[PDB]
Coordinates of C-alpha atoms in Angstrom, one line a residue:
Chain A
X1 CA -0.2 -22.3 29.5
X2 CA -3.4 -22.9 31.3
X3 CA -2.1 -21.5 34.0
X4 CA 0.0 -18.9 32.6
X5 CA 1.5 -16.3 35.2
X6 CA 0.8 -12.8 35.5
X7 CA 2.4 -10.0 37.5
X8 CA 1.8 -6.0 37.5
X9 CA 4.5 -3.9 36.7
X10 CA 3.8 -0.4 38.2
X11 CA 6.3 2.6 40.1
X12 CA 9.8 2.0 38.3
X13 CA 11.4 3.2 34.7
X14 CA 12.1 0.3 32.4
X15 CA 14.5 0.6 29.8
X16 CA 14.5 -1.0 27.0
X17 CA 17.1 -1.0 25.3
X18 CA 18.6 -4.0 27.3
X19 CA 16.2 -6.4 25.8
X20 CA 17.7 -5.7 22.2
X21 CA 21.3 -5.5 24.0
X22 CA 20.7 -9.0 25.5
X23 CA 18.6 -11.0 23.2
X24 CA 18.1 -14.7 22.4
X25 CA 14.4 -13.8 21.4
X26 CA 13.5 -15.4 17.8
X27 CA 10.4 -13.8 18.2
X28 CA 9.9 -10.1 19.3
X29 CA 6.4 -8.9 17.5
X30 CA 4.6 -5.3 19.1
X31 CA 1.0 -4.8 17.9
X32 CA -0.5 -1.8 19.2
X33 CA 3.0 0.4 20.0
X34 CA 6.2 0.7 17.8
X35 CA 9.5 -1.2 19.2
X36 CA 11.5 1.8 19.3
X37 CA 8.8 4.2 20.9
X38 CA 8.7 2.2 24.4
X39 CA 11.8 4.4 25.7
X40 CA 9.5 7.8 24.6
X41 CA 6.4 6.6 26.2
X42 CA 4.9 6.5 29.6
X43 CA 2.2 3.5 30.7
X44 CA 0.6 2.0 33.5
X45 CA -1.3 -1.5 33.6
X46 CA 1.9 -3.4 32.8
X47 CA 1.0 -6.8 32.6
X48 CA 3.6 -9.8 31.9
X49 CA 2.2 -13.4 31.2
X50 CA 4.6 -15.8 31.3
Chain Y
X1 CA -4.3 -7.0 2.1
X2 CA -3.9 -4.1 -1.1
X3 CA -3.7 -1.3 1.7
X4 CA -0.7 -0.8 3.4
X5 CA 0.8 2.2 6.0
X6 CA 4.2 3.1 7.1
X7 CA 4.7 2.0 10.4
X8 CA 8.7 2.8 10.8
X9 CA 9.9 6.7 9.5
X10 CA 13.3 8.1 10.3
X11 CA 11.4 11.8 11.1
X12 CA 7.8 13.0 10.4
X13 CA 6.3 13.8 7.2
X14 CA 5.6 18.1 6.0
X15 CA 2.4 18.7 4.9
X16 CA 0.9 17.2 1.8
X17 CA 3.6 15.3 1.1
X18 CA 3.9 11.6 -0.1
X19 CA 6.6 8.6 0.6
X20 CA 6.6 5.5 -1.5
X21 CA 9.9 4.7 -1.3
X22 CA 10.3 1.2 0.0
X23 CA 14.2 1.3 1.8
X24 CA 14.8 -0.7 4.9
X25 CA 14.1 1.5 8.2
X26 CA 17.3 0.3 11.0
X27 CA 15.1 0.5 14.7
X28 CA 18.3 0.1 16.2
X29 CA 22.1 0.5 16.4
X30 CA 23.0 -2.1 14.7
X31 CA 22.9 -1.2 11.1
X32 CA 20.4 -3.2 8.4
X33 CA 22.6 -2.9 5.4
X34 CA 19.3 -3.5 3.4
X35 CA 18.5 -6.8 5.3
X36 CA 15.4 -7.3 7.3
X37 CA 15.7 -9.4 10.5
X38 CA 16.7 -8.6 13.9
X39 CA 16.5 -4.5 14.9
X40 CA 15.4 -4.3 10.9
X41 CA 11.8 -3.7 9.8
X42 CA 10.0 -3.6 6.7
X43 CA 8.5 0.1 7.2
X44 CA 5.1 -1.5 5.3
X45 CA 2.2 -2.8 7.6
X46 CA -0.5 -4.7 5.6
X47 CA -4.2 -4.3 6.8
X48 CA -6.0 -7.4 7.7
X49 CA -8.9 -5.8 6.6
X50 CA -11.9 -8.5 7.1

């Protein structure tokens, strides 16, 4: 946790859907962007911290 | 925590019009059957107004 890893996610379409197809997550809270939007919306600045 | 929004709508709202009923929203394909939990949202977002 104090050294928690990051990577960019940039240049591909992510889908997903397959998160909720495939999903052992207890947890699965969004804050500033609905669940159900993410397939409807375009980013960049994808960051993941592991 | 007395002010609330509605995060989760199945379609948009017309002008000047008001929605207070509190039914379960499904955000997915599985249906809710009235149950919160996973792919099932309360549409009601509390403020953490501080």
């Amino acid at each position: 946790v104090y050294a928690w890893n990051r990577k960019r996610i940039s240049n591909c379409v992510a889908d997903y859907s397959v998160l909720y197809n495939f999903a052992p997550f207890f947890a699965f809270k969004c804050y500033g962007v609905s669940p159900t939007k993410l397939n409807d919306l375009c980013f960049t600045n994808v960051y993941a911290d592991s | 925590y007395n002010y609330l929004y509605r995060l989760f709508r199945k379609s948009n709202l017309k002008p000047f019009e008001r929605d207070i009923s509190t039914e379960i929203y499904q955000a997915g394909n599985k249906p809710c059957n009235g149950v919160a939990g996973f792919n099932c949202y309360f549409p009601l977002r509390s403020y953490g107004f501080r």
